[PDB]
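Attaching the record inline, Q. Sequence:
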Amino acid sequence: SLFVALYDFVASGDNTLSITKGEKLRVLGYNHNGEWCEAQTKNGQGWVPSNYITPVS
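Structure, as predicted:
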């Protein structure tokens, strides 16, 4: 299924993705594993940990 943004994030570098909590951020692609998944933001883009995003179920 698809997951939505749950917890917020904090800047780090030119790779991470700083977003807000309960924000509209869904995973589009993965890192080819169950570690991290790449997501996009209305502001820009960046990486997003699955530990910061949960499924819709």
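Residues 6 and 22 are 5 Å apart (CA to CA). The chain has no helices and five strands.

More tomorrow.
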